[PDB]
Amino acid sequence: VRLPGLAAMRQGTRLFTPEQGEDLREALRRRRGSFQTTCEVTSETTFAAARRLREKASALAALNFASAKNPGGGFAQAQEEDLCRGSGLYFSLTSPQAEPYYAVNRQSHSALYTDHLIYSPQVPIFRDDAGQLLPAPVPVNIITAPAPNAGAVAQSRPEQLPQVLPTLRERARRVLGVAAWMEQTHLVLGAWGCGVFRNDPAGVARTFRELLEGEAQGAFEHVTFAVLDNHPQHPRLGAFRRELESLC
Ligand SMILES: Nc1ncnc2c1ncn2[C@@H]1O[C@H](COP(=O)(O)OP(=O)(O)OC[C@H]2O[C@H](O)[C@H](O)[C@@H]2O)[C@@H](O)[C@H]1O
């Protein structure tokens, strides 16, 4: 039997294409300065922060650190695979209206990828980090978008090194734009493509702070930076807790 709410979520899945770039930013324009946005930086999985936030969240979204070319990356410690294994996310990403995101990114043949985004509405979270069933599934809206593959650019197309940060910046700005366009209140963010994609975590953390301070100030009610870091150094979390203490 097909698990609860997968149908309604897959049927509602929706693609934002790069030609919606200005539709997304006028949605940020229109929503800027609506709340006193409270923001944290934590050590939880993105789904653990989602399930915690749920009961006081009118509209909850979370960022999938996605593969540009294969849904769920093709599966093996990554965050996108954590969400697929414990939610209906995969049934949404393989949905027909989502195909152009993968199709175009592969034809792109560029490690900075395109600006397509996939919006997955009311994705059921079925399991906690331990992997046991929840009593009841917890819905979370998911924004899927690929951070530029910095590691690949450095080994494959170093001429696009200068475009890495600008790509991540305009794409981050569209991720906020999709969440305001869908009028979300509570965002679960994190160390976006600072793992397998090898971006600088100080840089991703700073880009988020620039946006949350600039074009997206006030635009959301709560932003939680759910960075998981098991390495004894904790380099990712340290960079996000260090660079976003200004904002909290
Ligand atoms: N479940 C998790 N929850 C919250 N944060 C996490 C989690 N797992 C890792 N992090 C933290 O977030 C950081 C980045 O996690 P990454 O999964 O590497 O995303 P990317 O931007 O580097 O590239 C995504 C590729 O990886 C896959 O193959 C995709 O299919 C893509 O191909 C990690 O270092 C953790 O600190």
Residue numbers in the entry: 29 to 103, 107 to 279
From the paper:
The radio-resistant bacterium D. radiodurans encodes a PARG homolog, DrPARG, whose expression is upregulated after radiation damage, so it might play an important role in DNA repair. From observing the structural peculiarities of DrPARG, we show that although previously thought to be an obligate exo-glycohydrolase, bacterial PARG could exert both exo- and endo-glycohydrolase functions.
To clarify the effect of Thr267 on enzyme activity of DrPARG, we generated mutants of DrPARG by substituting Thr267 for arginine or lysine. Furthermore, we determined crystal structures of DrPARG T267R and T267K in complex with ADP-ribose for understanding the detailed interactions. Compared with the solvent-accessible 2′-OH with n + 1 linkage point observed in wild-type, which were inaccessible and less accessible to solvent in the complex structures of T267R and T267K, respectively. PARG cleavage assay in vitro showed T267R and T267K mutants with decreased hydrolysis PAR activity as compared with the wild-type enzyme. Consistent with in vitro cleavage assay, the mutants designed for blocking endo-glycohydrolase activity showed significantly decreased turnover rate Kcat as compared with the wild-type DrPARG, so the mutants may have reduced activity toward PAR. Since T267R and T267K DrPARG catalyze the hydrolysis of PAR without generating short-chain PAR but oligo ADP-ribose, the establishment of endo-glycohydrolase activity was not solely accounted from the lack of steric hinderance near 2′-OH.
